[PDB]
Amino acid sequence: RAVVEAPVEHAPIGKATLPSTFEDSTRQGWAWDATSGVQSALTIKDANESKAISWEVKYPEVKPVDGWASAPRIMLGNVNTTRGNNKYLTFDFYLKPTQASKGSLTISLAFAPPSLGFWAQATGDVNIPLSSLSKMKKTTDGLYHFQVKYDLDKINDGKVLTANTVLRDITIVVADGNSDFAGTMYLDNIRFE
Numbered sequence: 001r002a003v004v005e006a007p008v009e010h011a012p013i014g015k016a017t018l019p020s021t022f023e024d025s026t027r028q029g030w031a032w033d034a035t036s037g038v039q040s041a042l043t044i045k046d047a048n049e050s051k052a053i054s055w056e057v058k059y060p061e062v063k064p065v066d067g068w069a070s071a072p073r074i075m076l077g078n079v080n081t082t083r084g085n086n087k088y089l090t091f092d093f094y095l096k097p098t099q100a101s102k103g104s105l106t107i108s109l110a111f112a113p114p115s116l117g118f119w120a121q122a123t124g125d126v127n128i129p130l131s132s133l134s135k136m137k138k139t140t141d142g143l144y145h146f147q148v149k150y151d152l153d154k155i156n157d158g159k160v161l162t163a164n165t166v167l168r169d170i171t172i173v174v175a176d177g178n179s180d181f182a183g184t185m186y187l188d189n190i191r192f193e
């Protein structure tokens with residue numbers, strides 16, 4: 001399936017770069033997957049005083065039965081990197097909600113390793129309940145700041161990311177778990193550590 005929406009003003013793709021810091025005002029190789037349920041503009045915006053890739057999402061009130069159908073699914077294609085000695089992939093994730101009070105966002109990480117069937121998914125999905133947000137302090141520019149980490153030794157389906165396993169693509173999915181979220185999302189400093 002290809003999810004298709006007319007393009008509008010959006011940031012240039014640039015070239016795949018890790019760490020991805022967006023400081024050149026390009027997407028540094030990040031783009032929607034063809035199957036991403038969100039196909040709206042990807043722009044570089046300031047978040048917490050640094051350039052970040054960003055998009056808006058208003059999830060449907062009627063939730064699809066497939067829990068990724070409505071999800072932003074963004075991917076770094078053809079980076080062809082390896083984790084090396086790094087145990088984690090981590091990034092800054094920011095929310096600027098216009099609505100957020102119930103259910104949760106679940107953030108998943110996957111990769112496309114040509115040695116492992118072009119898919120390997122981190123076991124450690126990260127759940128962000130939206131009722132938790134009210135009690136978090138916002139950045140000065142009014143964002144909720146998360147630093148999300150994935151232990152790359154915990155992968156599904158018995159697949160193993162060796163130090164030298166080539167990772168052709170990296171994918172991040174922000175799934176709506178019965179939430180009322182609407183607003184802006186941002187990623188920055190996507191890196192291994």
Ligand SMILES: [Ca+2]
Nearest residue numbers: 021050051188
């Ligand atoms: Ca940045």
